[PDB]
Amino acid sequence: DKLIGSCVWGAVNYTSNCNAECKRRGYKGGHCGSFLNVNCWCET
């Protein structure tokens, strides 16, 4: 997983569609972590 942003409102690197963002950039997917769903962790 790669830290590109945060899946939490208010955060500077806020991004809701983390999965799409990561997929767009060129990653396997996105899930914001399978527990610590605070950061936009790109599946990789």
Swiss-Prot record:
- What does the sequence similarity comment in the record state about its family? Belongs to the invertebrate defensin family. Type 2 subfamily.
**What subcellular compartments does it reside in?**
Secreted
**Mainly localized where?**
secreted
In which organism is this protein found? Archaeoprepona demophon
State what protein this is by name.
Answer: Defensin ARD1
What this chain does, per the entry, is described as: Possesses potent anti-fungal activity.
Keywords carried by this UniProt record:
Antimicrobial, Defensin, Disulfide bond, Fungicide, Immunity, Innate immunity, Secreted
Q: Which GO CC annotations does the UniProt entry carry? A: extracellular region
Q: Does the keyword Secreted feature in the UniProt annotation?
A: yes
**InterPro entries linked to this entry:** Defensin_invertebrate/fungal, Scorpion_toxin-like_sf
Whether Disulfide bond counts among this entry's keywords is yes
- The record lists its disulfide bonds as C7-C32, C18-C40, C22-C42
Domain of life according to the entry: Eukaryota
Query: What is this organism's lineage?
Result: Eukaryota, Metazoa, Ecdysozoa, Arthropoda, Hexapoda
Q: Name one GO biological process term.
A: defense response
